[PDB]
Design a binder for this molecule. Sequence first.
Ligand SMILES: O=C(O)c1cnn(-c2nc3cc(Cl)c(F)cc3[nH]2)c1
Ligand SMILES: [Fe+2]
Length: 212
Amino acid sequence: LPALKLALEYIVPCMNKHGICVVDDFLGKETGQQIGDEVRALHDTGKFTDGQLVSQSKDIRGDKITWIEGKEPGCETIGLLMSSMDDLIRHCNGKLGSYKINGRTKAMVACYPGNGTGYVRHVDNPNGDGRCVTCIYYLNKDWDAKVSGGILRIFPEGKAQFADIEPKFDRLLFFWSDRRNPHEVQPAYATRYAITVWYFDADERARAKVKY
Ligand SMILES: O=C(O)c1cnn(-c2nc3cc(Cl)c(F)cc3[nH]2)c1
Ligand SMILES: [Fe+2]
């Protein structure tokens, strides 16, 4: 699908009504794997962090991250993922809420190591830091959450219920970054890779430059 069709027939009507959207088979199996390769090559070559400190001798650590600009050697299909997320957002064109989305972060590549850690419930942006849309791309080939866990559970707020989102291969996830969408990753018992880019609201981002 061209970014424009997906954006206007799906992303926008979905985001404005539910505030969470899932695009399956986003880039297709060939490109999907290429990203998998590049992400694994980052892991294998020691670029990831530490890991999130879950339990504070031999402590327990969680998701490792790396920021990727997209032009790095060995990171080109990720760069290309990013450009294609950017195309989607641009073809929304101030149709996402009242938002004027003028920029974004580098890409946070995440590796959950499969040691039963998840990510405690959280709000990507609680204090008004600029971030208004969270875009996540999952690269997990033949993921079974019944066996490996790692489901992402969102608590869209003002709602009795949650939405469980499996970190399926070639899945792309959009959701409002603020207090409307509290979420968590359930414990992952297998390596779980994801890539996140956050989109900035012009105004909120513009005010945050002085406050932080
Ligand atoms: O892979 C996931 O499904 C997932 C869901 N939220 N999450 C998560 N990682 C994050 C990292 C940072 Cl620095 C942050 F500020 C907010 C974050 N939110 C990852
Ligand atoms: Fe998050």
